Amino acid sequence: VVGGLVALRGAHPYIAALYWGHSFCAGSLIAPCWVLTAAHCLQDRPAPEDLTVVLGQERRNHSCEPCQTLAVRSYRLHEAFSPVSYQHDLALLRLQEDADGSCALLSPYVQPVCLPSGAPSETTLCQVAGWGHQFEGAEEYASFLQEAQVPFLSLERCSAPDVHGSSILPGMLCAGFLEGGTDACQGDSGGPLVCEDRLTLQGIISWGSGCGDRNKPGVYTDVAYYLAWIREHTVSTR
Ligand X SMILES: *[C@@H]1O[C@H](CO)[C@@H](O[C@@H]2O[C@H](CO)[C@@H](O[C@H]3O[C@H](CO)[C@@H](O)[C@H](O)[C@@H]3O)[C@H](O)[C@H]2NC(C)=O)[C@H](O)[C@H]1NC(C)=O
Nearest-approach distance from CB 15 to ligand X, in angstroms:
12
Provide the total of helices (H) and of strands (E) in the chain, helices listed first.
Answer: 2, 15
E-state strands within the chain: 5-6, 15-20, 23-31, 34-37, 52-55, 68-70, 72-77, 91-95, 126-130, 146-149, 152-153, 172-175, 192-196, 199-207, 218-222
Shortest reach from residue 220's CB to ligand X, in Å: 25
- Using CB under 6 A, which of 43, 61, 149, 154 touches ligand X? 61
| 19 binds ligand X, rule: CB under 6 A | yes
User: CB 20 → ligand X: shortest distance, Å?
Assistant: 6
Asked if 47 is part of the footprint of ligand X (rule: CB under 6 A), the reply reads no
Q: Looking at the DSSP assignment, which residues form a beta bridge with residue 221?
A: 172, 204
Residues 126-185 that bind ligand X (CB under 6 A): none
- The length of the chain, given as a count of residues: 238
* Member of 43, 44, 69, 227 binding ligand X (CB under 6 A): 69
User: Closer to ligand X at the Cβ: 65 or 197?
Assistant: 65
User: Residue numbers of the site for ligand X (CB under 6 A)?
Assistant: 17, 19-21, 52, 54, 61-63, 69
